[PDB]
């Protein structure tokens, strides 16, 4: 799917925000509410937003792409929300 710009340019930021979160958790083993909580709540809401957006996009209709949906649809998790 690298050809199409939107899906690529959204999965990339899905990975990059996860990089930032991985950094935040990596910082300390002690609990961190030192603005980490604020950006972390922002992060979970934003990641839910973009993940559900790409879910809507997934749902040439190639079998691999359409079949990949039902892994997540097993729980119906993002659609139910």
């Amino acid at each position: 799917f690298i050809l199409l710009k939107p899906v690529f340019h959204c999965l990339n930021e899905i990975l990059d925000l996860c990089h930032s979160f991985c950094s935040l958790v990596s910082q300390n083993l002690g609990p961190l509410d030192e603005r980490g909580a604020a950006q972390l709540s922002i992060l979970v809401k934003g990641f839910s937003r973009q993940s559900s957006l790409l879910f809507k996009i997934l749902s040439h209709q190639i079998n691999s792409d359409l079949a990949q949906l039902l892994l997540r649809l097993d729980y119906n998790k993002y659609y139910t929300q």
Partner: protein
């Protein structure tokens, strides 16, 4: 990084013995450790490489009051396992105390292997719960390893004993082992003596020699659980990578097993998934739900049908689960090895986090609570009382395991987002 298996206790040594024999036959290894002439596998994790193709496994065999370790020695495979790392009661306290005096030399045996390996990821314990000598010593060693290797991880192939309930102090022993395992073990794969015995009655007429035959079942589970590491693949090319999906929260790290062709002595992937999801293939004896499921199939598997197989399994809805966790079942593939029989060309296994095992924990806590009110078996042996005069480590274990039970049922609840 290479894995070292810390097989301890009589039962644990028996199952580690057979596991290494099973991987000898499966891999290109002879009973003397020589590369087989008849012989594509990543053997480096589990087998140390000698110069003259002596594939010696990284097994640490710990014996206490040895009886069956002499039998292990007088075997054709004694030359196969030669790191030369064997160093000489039925109570948990007795085993713990006996371990405490020899802790340094057994740990120097640990250090030698850790140094000899290029690198080290994991300690895999063939631990026995309430195993007399095995328990207590295994709990002590478990507490020691995490401290000295904080970054490193410990898995425990715990053979949880349920034999329809001889040792009278079983609930006490198992209770203490579970406290140590709940706070000081990175992962646990639970097995059940009664469950494997019931499978044994199902598949065969064997009832009386249950232990000897059930050892084979345990060996098959243990080898299949690692086959994806032992053979290259696209994903789960390392232990932690496999383990992560299986354990979503630290406390709930106990994993149920299952195997599709229990009579492994063509079938499509759709069939093997569904067969696996019924309870007969499961080897473990208010709403209840899985937290997460994983499955690995080794055989002549068509690639385009695996995704469609998971599609169909979703339609069947045979595995009912609505946990806090979002982890959906994933269909994984591994390589069936050559040189061994290919009966049942397609054969699969599942490893999963389920709330049902809380019941099995609560049964031994129930036996313990009854026995504790009676005080019928406090044992009162001078070892027992001198080691624990307060008898309050038992209560600490009771509250910790009760927290574990409550955490399981809270995971069943819709609101495990809150503290469990």
């Amino acid at each position: 990084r290479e894995i070292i298996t810390l097989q301890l206790g009589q039962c644990g040594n028996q199952i580690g013995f057979e596991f290494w024999k099973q991987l000898c036959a499966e891999h290109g290894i002879s009973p003397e450790g020589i590369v087989e002439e008849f012989a594509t596998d990543r053997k480096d994790v589990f087998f140390y490489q000698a110069d003259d193709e002596h594939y010696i496994p990284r097994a640490v065999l710990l014996d206490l009051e040895p009886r069956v370790i002499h039998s292990i020695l007088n075997s054709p495979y004694a030359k196969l396992y030669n790191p030369e790392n064997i160093y000489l009661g039925n109570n948990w306290a007795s085993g713990f105390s006996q371990g405490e005096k020899i802790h340094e030399d057994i740990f120097d045996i640990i250090d030698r292997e850790a140094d000899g390996s290029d690198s080290l990821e994991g300690f895999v314990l063939c631990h026995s719960i309430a195993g007399g000598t095995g328990s207590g010593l295994g709990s002590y060693l478990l507490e020691r390893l995490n401290d000295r290797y904080p970054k490193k991880l410990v898995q425990t192939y715990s053979v949880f004993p349920n034999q329809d309930e001889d040792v009278v102090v079983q609930p006490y022993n198992s209770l203490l082992t579970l406290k140590r395992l709940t706070q000081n073990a990175d992962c646990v794969v639970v097995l059940d003596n009664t469950a494997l015995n019931r499978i044994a009655t199902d598949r065969l007429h064997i009832q009386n020699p249950s232990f000897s035959q059930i050892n084979q079942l345990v060996s098959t589970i243990m080898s299949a659980s690692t086959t994806t590491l032992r053979y290259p693949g696209y994903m789960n090319n390392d232990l932690i990578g496999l383990i992560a999906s299986l354990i979503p929260t630290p406390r709930l790290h106990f994993l149920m097993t299952g195997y599709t062709p229990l009579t492994t002595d063509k079938t499509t992937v759709l069939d093997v998934m569904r067969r696996l999801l019924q309870p007969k293939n499961v080897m473990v004896s208010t709403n209840h739900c899985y937290i997460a499921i994983l499955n690995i199939i080794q055989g002549e598997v068509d690639p385009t049908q695996v995704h469609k197989s998971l599609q169909r399994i979703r339609e069947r809805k045979l595995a009912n689960f609505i946990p806090w966790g979002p982890a959906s079942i994933q269909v994984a593939l591994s390589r069936k090895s050559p040189y061994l029989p290919s009966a049942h060309r397609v054969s699969g296994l599942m490893m999963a986090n389920h709330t049902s095992i809380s019941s099995l924990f609560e049964r031994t806590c129930r036996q313990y609570d009854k026995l504790r009110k009676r005080e019928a078996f406090l044992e009162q042996f001078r070892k027992e009382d001198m080691f624990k005069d307060n008898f309050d480590e038992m209560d600490t274990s009771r509250e910790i395991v009760q927290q574990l039970i409550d955490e399981y049922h809270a995971a069943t609840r819709p609101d495990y987002i809150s503290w469990g």
